[PDB]
Structure formats: structure tokens, C-alpha cells
Design an enzyme around this catalytic site. Structure first.
Site, short mmCIF file in Angstrom:
data_model
loop_
_atom_site.label_atom_id
_atom_site.label_comp_id
_atom_site.label_asym_id
_atom_site.label_seq_id
_atom_site.Cartn_x
_atom_site.Cartn_y
_atom_site.Cartn_z
CE1 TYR A 108 0.75 3.98 -5.98
CE2 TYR A 108 0.11 5.73 -4.48
CZ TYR A 108 -0.22 4.80 -5.44
OH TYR A 108 -1.53 4.69 -5.86
CG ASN A 157 -1.95 -1.18 1.08
OD1 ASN A 157 -2.09 -1.97 2.02
ND2 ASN A 157 -2.62 -1.29 -0.06
CB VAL A 175 0.41 6.13 2.91
CG1 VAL A 175 -0.39 4.95 3.42
CG2 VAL A 175 1.71 6.26 3.68
CB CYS A 176 -2.14 4.45 -1.95
SG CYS A 176 -1.76 5.88 -2.89
CB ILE A 177 -4.90 3.24 3.03
CG1 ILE A 177 -4.56 4.49 3.85
CG2 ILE A 177 -3.74 2.26 3.06
CD1 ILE A 177 -4.29 4.19 5.30
#
Ligand code: OXL
Ligand code: OXL
Ligand code: ZN
Ligand code: ZN
Lengths: 69, 154
Positions: B81, B79, B86-88
Site C-alpha cells: 500500500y 502487494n 504489506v498485503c499478502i
């Protein structure tokens, strides 16, 4: 305008079906973004900075100890 | 401004009762829009005792929009990159669990300490890490261990 006693905005609340309620300006700002209920679905500064910096490298130091066991 | 008021109050609240393994606040009270958070990998999880610094950059219209959160160290995680972003769900602006003004820095960090322990297998900030997390769980545990070592400077 603003309350003459305290100098705050003095603005109306708007209530919604689901029960929850908010300032009219706050809600509108949100509606602008999404058509849902925001809640459901629809002292010196220098002393503070130093405490924060000290807790950061205590976290690190303590992490090293737990790792090395 | 609302953003600055919320942020000052969140920081005060945060500081009163900080969750175990998280230190978060502005890097300088002259600019409450730029924070650092240190998160420790929870015990008995695969990122155990790792210490991961991330920067939170808050939008002018907070809490209408989420802050951007970027891990500053090196990470290998489904999750996150390559650059550390942070990609949630909770960090995405408006069927998941998206951002609402009722969230907080605190809830963001709870969410992130959660994702370290239990990855979102089917989300692709990091394909390589997603695949491995399933196929070669055993290697992933090894890469995770050296990620911890590195965050600790060792
Ligand atoms: O008088 C007032 O209410 C003010 O200046 O905000
Ligand atoms: O001024 C208003 O909008 C009110 O009283 O509801
Ligand atoms: Zn409000
Ligand atoms: Zn509601």
C-alpha cells in the site's frame, strides 16, 4: 490449578483426527477464530540490543558495496 | 502471556540462525510487541541489494492473529500500500494461505522476501504497480532500481 512442583498450568491436551494435538485452552482460543486445525486445514539485554543494531547497519553497509559493483 | 512468550522464543530462535539478508527483532526488549525488520532484496532479483526496513506490530493475542507489517521506506510493488502496509495472504487474519498459529515471524519474512522476487500480479494493494508489472515490465525494472537507490540513501 497449577503444578505444585513447577508452577506451570498443568492442563489437558485435546487430540484431533488429522493426528496433531494441542493444549485445550490454546485450541479453544483458536476455534474461537476459525474452525480448522491450526497445523493443517481441518545474558544481558543491552548486549543483545547492541548486537542487533550492529547487524542492521552492517547489512546496510554491505548492501551498498554489492550495489556499487 | 502467550504472545510475549512466543515472541521471546521466536526472537531467540530467529537470532540463532538468521536467513541471509534479514535482520529482525524488537526495537527494545521492554516491548516485544514492536519489532523492526530489515530485508535485503535478493541478488539477481529486480530489488537486488535494496535494504527495506519494515515495522511489525504484534497483536495482544498473537499468535492467534498476524502482526501488521509496514515498510517504512518508499516502495513500488503490487502487494504494498501507499503508506507501506504489506498485503499478502499470510498477513490476513482469519483459498489463499492465511494466518495460522503455526506460522511465525520467520515464515512471514521468508514470504516477504519471496514476494519481492515474484509479485502477486492479481492483488491490488498497488494497481499501478500491478499493471506495469505485466504490460511494461521494462519500466517496472527501472522504477525498482531507483527504489533500491533510495533505500540505500543514494
Ligand atoms: O502454588 C502454586 O501452584 C502457585 O502459586 O501457582
Ligand atoms: O480434568 C480433565 O479435564 C481431564 O482429566 O481430562
Ligand atoms: Zn499450547
Ligand atoms: Zn492437523
Amino acid at each position: 490449578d497449577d503444578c505444585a512442583i513447577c508452577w506451570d498450568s498443568m492442563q489437558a491436551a485435546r487430540k484431533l483426527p488429522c493426528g496433531h494435538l494441542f493444549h485445550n485452552s490454546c485450541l479453544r482460543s483458536w476455534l474461537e477464530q476459525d474452525t480448522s486445525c491450526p497445523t493443517c486445514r481441518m545474558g544481558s539485554a543491552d548486549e543483545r540490543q547492541r548486537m542487533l543494531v550492529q547487524r542492521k547497519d552492517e547489512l546496510l553497509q554491505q548492501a551498498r558495496k554489492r550495489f556499487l559493483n | 502471556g502467550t504472545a510475549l512468550k512466543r515472541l521471546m522464543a521466536e526472537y531467540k530462535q530467529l537470532t540463532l540462525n538468521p536467513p541471509e539478508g534479514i535482520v529482525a527483532g524488537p526495537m527494545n526488549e521492554e516491548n516485544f510487541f514492536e519489532w523492526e525488520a530489515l530485508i535485503m532484496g535478493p541478488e539477481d532479483t529486480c530489488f537486488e541489494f535494496g535494504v527495506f526496513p519494515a515495522i511489525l506490530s504484534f497483536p495482544l493475542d498473537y499468535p492467534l492473529s498476524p502482526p501488521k507489517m509496514r515498510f517504512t521506506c518508499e516502495m513500488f510493488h503490487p502487494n504494498i500500500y501507499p503508506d507501506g502496509r504489506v498485503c499478502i495472504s499470510i498477513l490476513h487474519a482469519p483459498s489463499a494461505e492465511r494466518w495460522s498459529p503455526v506460522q511465525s515471524v520467520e515464515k512471514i519474512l521468508l514470504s516477504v522476501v519471496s514476494m519481492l522476487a515474484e509479485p502477486n500480479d492479481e492483488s491490488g494493494a498497488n494497481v499501478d504497480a500491478s499493471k506495469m508489472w505485466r504490460d511494461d515490465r521494462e519500466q517496472f525494472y527501472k522504477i525498482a532500481k531507483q527504489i533500491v537507490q533510495k533505500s540505500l540513501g543514494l
